[PDB]
């Protein structure tokens, strides 16, 4: 499977995906990395790995549909089978999501359905859980609500900040995101007809 990774930041999830897709029995290859922001370290990481990049600045488009269409043009340009959202910070429109249904994965730093949204660590700390985690899910129109592929629990330590908890959860993300990509890229896991996760 030919894979696109969309990013908006540092790209530590991108990095773990690069490393894993290049291990010997991989069913996936990363052929493009697209950022919606310029000068993010995730772009340098892509280039240092010899992977093409594109910056599609979301602020240059009048609405979501048009920004998403520009992204889709690059995806078709590169003949992409699977899209991975790895720290990508834009909610995608219905038509984009519908087109990419069953072929787009996201990594989210909580155990869904808890702590949906972009500030999950802040929510976890405020709520006082002693256990949080991360989730790889298929992307649905409903934000952070698509079908769950993998999850990994991560403890919250007394006196954690957003930063310390965030780093602990990243360590788990770097394991399940590559394992989940490999599940989809091979036969193994698909979004079935009945809209549910199916293990072939």
Curated annotation (Swiss-Prot):
The record marks 144 as: Raises pKa of active site His. The active site is at 108 (proton donor). Residues 3-200 are annotated as: GART domain. It comes from the Eukaryota. (6R)-10-formyltetrahydrofolate binds at residues 64, 89-92, 106, 140-144. N(1)-(5-phospho-beta-D-ribosyl)glycinamide binds at residues 11-13, 170-173. Trifunctional enzyme that catalyzes three distinct reactions as part of the 'de novo' inosine monophosphate biosynthetic pathway. Homodimer. In the N-terminal section; belongs to the GARS family. The N-terminal ATP-grasp domain carries the phosphoribosylamine--glycine ligase activity. The central AIRS domain carries the phosphoribosylformylglycinamidine cyclo-ligase activity. This is Trifunctional purine biosynthetic protein adenosine-3. The gene is GART. The chain holds residues 808 to 1007 of 1010 of the full protein.
């Amino acid at each position: 499977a030919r894979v696109a990774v969309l990013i908006s930041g540092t790209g530590s999830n991108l990095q773990a995906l690069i490393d894993s897709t290049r291990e010997p029995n991989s069913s996936a290859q990363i052929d493009i990395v697209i950022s919606n922001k310029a000068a993010v370290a995730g772009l340098d990481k892509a280039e240092r790995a010899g992977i093409p990049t594109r910056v599609i600045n979301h602020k240059l488009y009048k609405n979501r549909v048009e920004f998403d269409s520009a992204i889709d043009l690059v995806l078709e340009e590169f003949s992409i089978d699977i899209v991975c959202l790895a720290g990508f910070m834009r909610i995608l429109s219905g038509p984009f999501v519908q087109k990419w249904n069953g072929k787009m994965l996201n990594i989210h730093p909580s155990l869904l359905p808890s702590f949906k949204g972009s500030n999950a660590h802040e929510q976890a700390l405020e709520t006082g859980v002693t256990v949080t985690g991360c989730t790889v899910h298929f992307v649905a129109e409903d934000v952070d609500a698509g079908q769950i592929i993998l999850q990994e629990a991560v403890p919250v330590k007394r006196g954690d900040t957003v930063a310390t908890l965030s780093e602990r959860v990243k360590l788990a993300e770097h394991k399940i995101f590559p394992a989940a990509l490999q599940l989809v890229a091979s036969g193994t896991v698909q979004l079935g007809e009945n809209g549910k996760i199916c293990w072939v």
